[PDB]
Amino acid sequence: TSFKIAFIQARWHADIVDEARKSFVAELAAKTGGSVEVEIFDVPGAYEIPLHAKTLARTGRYAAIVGAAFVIDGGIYRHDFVATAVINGMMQVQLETEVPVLSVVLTPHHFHESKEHHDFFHAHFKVKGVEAAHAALQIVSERSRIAA
Amino acid sequence: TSFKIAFIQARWHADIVDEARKSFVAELAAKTGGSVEVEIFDVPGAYEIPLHAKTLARTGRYAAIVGAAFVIDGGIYRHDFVATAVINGMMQVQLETEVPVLSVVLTPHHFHESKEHHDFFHAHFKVKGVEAAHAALQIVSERSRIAA
Amino acid sequence: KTSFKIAFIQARWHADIVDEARKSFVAELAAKTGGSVEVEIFDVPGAYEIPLHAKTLARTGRYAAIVGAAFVIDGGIYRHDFVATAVINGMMQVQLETEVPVLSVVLTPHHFHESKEHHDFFHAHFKVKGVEAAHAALQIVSERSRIAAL
Amino acid sequence: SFKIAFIQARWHADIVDEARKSFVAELAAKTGGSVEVEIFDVPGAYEIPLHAKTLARTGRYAAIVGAAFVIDGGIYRHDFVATAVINGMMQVQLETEVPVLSVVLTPHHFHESKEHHDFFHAHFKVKGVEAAHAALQIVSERSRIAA
Amino acid sequence: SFKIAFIQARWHADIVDEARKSFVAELAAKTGGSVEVEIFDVPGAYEIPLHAKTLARTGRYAAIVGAAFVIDGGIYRHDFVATAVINGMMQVQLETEVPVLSVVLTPHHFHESKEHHDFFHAHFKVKGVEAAHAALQIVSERSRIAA
Amino acid sequence: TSFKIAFIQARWHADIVDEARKSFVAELAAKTGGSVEVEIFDVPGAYEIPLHAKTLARTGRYAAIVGAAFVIDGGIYRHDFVATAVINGMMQVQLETEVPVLSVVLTPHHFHESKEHHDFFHAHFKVKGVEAAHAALQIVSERSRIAA
Amino acid sequence: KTSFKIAFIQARWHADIVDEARKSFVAELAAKTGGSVEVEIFDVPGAYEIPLHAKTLARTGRYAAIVGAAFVIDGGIYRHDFVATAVINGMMQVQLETEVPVLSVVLTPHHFHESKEHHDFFHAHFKVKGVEAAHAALQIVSERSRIAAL
Amino acid sequence: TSFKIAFIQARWHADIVDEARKSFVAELAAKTGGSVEVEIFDVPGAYEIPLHAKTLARTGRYAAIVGAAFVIDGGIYRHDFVATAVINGMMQVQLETEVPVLSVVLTPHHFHESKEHHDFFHAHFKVKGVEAAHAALQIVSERSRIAA
Amino acid sequence: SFKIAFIQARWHADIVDEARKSFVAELAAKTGGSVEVEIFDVPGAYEIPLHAKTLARTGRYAAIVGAAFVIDGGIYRHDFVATAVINGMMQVQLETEVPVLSVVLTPHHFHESKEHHDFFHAHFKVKGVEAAHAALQIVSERSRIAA
Amino acid sequence: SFKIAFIQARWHADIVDEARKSFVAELAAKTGGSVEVEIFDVPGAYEIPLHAKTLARTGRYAAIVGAAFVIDGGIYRHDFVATAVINGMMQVQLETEVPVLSVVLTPHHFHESKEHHDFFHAHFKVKGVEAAHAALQIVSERSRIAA
Numbered sequence A, B, F, H: 001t002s003f004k005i006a007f008i009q010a011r012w013h014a015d016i017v018d019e020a021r022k023s024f025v026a027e028l029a030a031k032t033g034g035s036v037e038v039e040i041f042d043v044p045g046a047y048e049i050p051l052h053a054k055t056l057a058r059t060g061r062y063a064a065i066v067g068a069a070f071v072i073d074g075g076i077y078r079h080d081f082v083a084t085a086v087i088n089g090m091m092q093v094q095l096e097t098e099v100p101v102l103s104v105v106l107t108p109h110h111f112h113e114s115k116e117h118h119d120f121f122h123a124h125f126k127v128k129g130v131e132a133a134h135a136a137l138q139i140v141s142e143r144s145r146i147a148a
Numbered sequence C, G: 001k002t003s004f005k006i007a008f009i010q011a012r013w014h015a016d017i018v019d020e021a022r023k024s025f026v027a028e029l030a031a032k033t034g035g036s037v038e039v040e041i042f043d044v045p046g047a048y049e050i051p052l053h054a055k056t057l058a059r060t061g062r063y064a065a066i067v068g069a070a071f072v073i074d075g076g077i078y079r080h081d082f083v084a085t086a087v088i089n090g091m092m093q094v095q096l097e098t099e100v101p102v103l104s105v106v107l108t109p110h111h112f113h114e115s116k117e118h119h120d121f122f123h124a125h126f127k128v129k130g131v132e133a134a135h136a137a138l139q140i141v142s143e144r145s146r147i148a149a150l
Numbered sequence D, E, I, J: 001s002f003k004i005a006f007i008q009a010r011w012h013a014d015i016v017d018e019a020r021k022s023f024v025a026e027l028a029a030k031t032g033g034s035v036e037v038e039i040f041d042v043p044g045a046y047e048i049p050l051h052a053k054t055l056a057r058t059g060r061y062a063a064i065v066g067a068a069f070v071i072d073g074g075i076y077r078h079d080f081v082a083t084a085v086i087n088g089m090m091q092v093q094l095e096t097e098v099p100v101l102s103v104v105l106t107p108h109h110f111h112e113s114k115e116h117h118d119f120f121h122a123h124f125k126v127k128g129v130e131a132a133h134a135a136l137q138i139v140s141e142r143s144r145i146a147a
Ligand SMILES: O=c1[nH]c(NC[C@H](O)[C@H](O)[C@H](O)CO)c([N+](=O)[O-])c(=O)[nH]1
Pocket: A010, A011, A012, A044, A045, A046, A047, A048, A069, A070, A071, A072, A073, A074, A079, A082, E100, E101, E102, E103, E131, E134
């Protein structure tokens, strides 16, 4: 259980996204005792994740890649076109690069830049991060077992 | 007609998903006296099914692959994105690998984590499993036919 | 040339309604081509199983066109659009990569609650779509044969 | 002086034609016949992508135009095809690298009523002219860029 | 120092423009002219993908930016195109592995009114800044994870 | 059980609406040997039914009133508003007048003025008419019962 | 007082499913009130015919509460919400003007395509709603009897 | 066929609304030769129509009242709350005042302040006006026949 | 120093209670016990309007508060009742002319999950305080106006 | 000369305010103070209807105006209230036959952002003007059709 993971994090809503990252890193720390290295990569926004993952993926250096971003409807434009582009983008890359790309590119039904909202997700992303943590291990692990 | 099917089950809502698997397997068993071997492959969540299926498909070890997951709207984030990515994912994969990927990656209009909803799908997935069984059989059968 | 083959891939969900499109489709060609055009029928579990089948059949080079027939309806339990999309996109993709025409008769109603009226309505309508399909098939296979490939 | 393949779906031809006629008219006007437009009949919008690809691959055309009226007729969902097509053309031009212009419009509402049929029979003439320019423009640009 | 191809749709040009002007401005106030931005005009958002692919292929650009205003004019559905363009770009940058930043905006509403116009006319300035930073940040990041 | 019913039919889509009337009347005729007299009242459109029903109801001349209309979305303006106003209207009216107002004021999810749609509803309204007939009978019957 | 009457007005559309709510409703009261509470049943064509009936019955003063039971479902042909609304509003209005409680068991599913699962599901569920109704009826009739009317 | 009609017209989108008025007046002119007087009343917006109709109605001076307004979604706020309030408002008034109130308070699915749009409705309202014209007569007439 | 009738639906009591407790707490705090709040249990939100009317008509209360959590449970449509209630209360206060405050909230989403139950158990405390103020305020205003 | 009761909800007060200030301003610049506007504060939009009924009853007002900003905060559904308030007002002015102008706005979107806030903060000024004119026009019209 010793391999590298490239955590790609969009910078939109950094405080929320960061919570997922921190939580991801911490959980793995607690499960693998650092035997799993998590390299963090910043990226402008979600849209920038697919390509970045593609690149970081083909380097062969990572057992899995994580895409973390908060794509929300800010009330002026439509966030879904990107969300789709990105959730699909990652799926495409991993299908190509055959390197697992876990998604922590969440899009909430509602997020109006309010305390309640902002606090809810600031907190939830932690949960999500832990989920991503386990998923990452589980997948990498099973692929290994699968591998011939 | 003695072959192997890869049953890739996501682990979210496992209790529900398992019902589709158990059913799927039991049907094939009954309908094929055991001729069909169904190898189970766990996976974090639906988003992990495509690649897994590609990886598993390309081994050529299986006559057909089944993607099983319950992708639901949990009232917090949007689920349709991943749902799409996966349903498309499996389609893409099977088109590349030329290996039948059956979809038991279901998305209900409503699943609110209540006795009713859970009881409903825990029960329904059994039906879907049986459906996937007959589908797998039928498709694997038809392909080999048009092959000759 | 007027003589060629068409692989008619039909999903078996709502087989009753899908069948009508087939029966109709075949009848139209027979009535137009006069048997000149052969329509081979392939059964498939559900619409999702159409893309790959169409691809495999397309690659055989035995057909001037493939036809995907299916009724992808919302059953009030799961969302049907996800598959419908994959299928409508799948056929589009298969035909795009295999350069073999794939006509869609994979219909998705706004409403279909399996009630006498609904069943009856579409059972009848699919006949119409089938005819349209036949004409489209002839039209497209033809138009392509007259293309200045330069 | 170049060739343009204009693929026109036949569903709602009365309306599709309208966009194609204005296209031909405009190019004829703006390029005085210099730019040739080859019209290609096609059953429905779904048949456009592949046709587009095939023609683009002949290398004969500077650009291709997909013209279709994909509307919601009240019985089935049109969006699935519309998507497969708007995406299909987009996919073909990205593949063949032959600009594919879209005149595959999908109205919010079109109920086969006089008001509607009349509105779009009219509006497609406008769209067709827009296609014309967009065509000329893009083709032009690709050269300015190729040099 | 590097170059950025800025492909801009011409629909709602005056609004799209603000995005560009701002982008070019911000970069100057950040690269002091180091980063050169070349503007390319294209008919509509649908015309961006292929252009960005073409320009990407050249290798002359560290990143490509697509700017367009794809709104619901109230007659046809714009989401089909919006989707195609957004995917298109993402697809192109994935093939060419050349960053393609999106400034292909689609507002929930835009009814050609003083209020609406004046709002995005100004907001595209903001977005253009964001597009500037993103480009710098992404182009920077890529080269880094490369060395 | 020999009484009068006021059948208020809007004239939009008359060809469709008439089918409900003709059917309504024929059913009562058959089921009541003519005992039930159904007086027909034309009206511009659905929006005109409520008042008309009030006016007609208050005469006390009728045991029950029927509002018949096809209120559809013609793709230009919104129909739901009037649809609502009328369906509520009839309800309001009957609650005031204490006179049963049956609703055959139908609104289809889709009616695009095509052979199919028209043929469909021209035929269906006949069924609805029959339904309204049995409803009228039943309701008038039940009321008089609880009256005794 | 524990002894009083309830007029249970039930629409006859989907009578099979509506009936379950009634059977259940009555059984619950009998199991709680022990016959102390009488439930008179009145049949009505459809939900739309509930408001006025409830009003007429309310005005009789014979009931401590009225209960409207109906399944107002989207049948994939016409919009059901218009009526559903009129009915849910109607009962609310009747009870408001007649000062007589009117409990709603006029349920409208997100989805009901008259398929085995759907029918079965609601056929069973209405039993639950019926129980809830009985409890609500008792609860409300009671709470009102303990109100300081000053 | 000699009576008075109070045409109440909101002033939002006056040019479009006006088309309905002009057309209304003209049609009646052509059918009743002025034997039907149409009194025009201006009103700020649609919301102001109900009360105005109520007042003008109770004066007993009019056989019918027409509400004309164009309530549209201007893209910033929601027009429906008003639309509903108004379409219901008129229905309520006429049910009260028992004076027919015809509705020419149209709400289009789309109207983005564009030439195509603006021209379409500038033209359609004429049609609608003619419809209102006939409806008005028909209703007033039938109510008369109905009257005892 | 006046009386307030607080009608609380019992569906999702755990959450409804939360809004009622904070209401009582606030008034007790702000009015030091001066303002009395009488709690009235009610089966569901639908039972509130009538109760509201009845109580308002006793003339005993300065204001009435309807508290309920009307949510979409995934099986039936909640909006019909929600409407009948938000309108019903509004109708009653317009009738009885006794201000009726609404704490009959309808969440966009509430799936009986921990995250949700926890969020609203929390948020209802906030709403309850808002009710408290709104109550005090409106009652106060009506007097300032009655004089 | 006459008086206009201006009931204003306090939610999003700063925005609602602009509406009022503008209204009062416009009237001054049109009645030179002839028309006196009395402001009444109320907790939320739901609290307007009854107040407008009460104030209407007084007879002291030629017209009543309800101003509120009822937006979708992203947690609960606001349309229930919006509807109740809008209907409420319309209902009240119908009973009391006292004009009740609505400045109870509900934006498609408003996510508590600089852009959103600043936009309605300014637009409510515009709306307030409209509300001014409408009041003058309606109060004028009524008295006319009365004489
Ligand atoms: O990560 C996000 N990026 C966003 N930007 C989109 C994209 O990721 C890039 O930043 C930029 O579009 C140019 O590529 C978002 N919105 O625009 O709303 C958002 O919500 N979340």
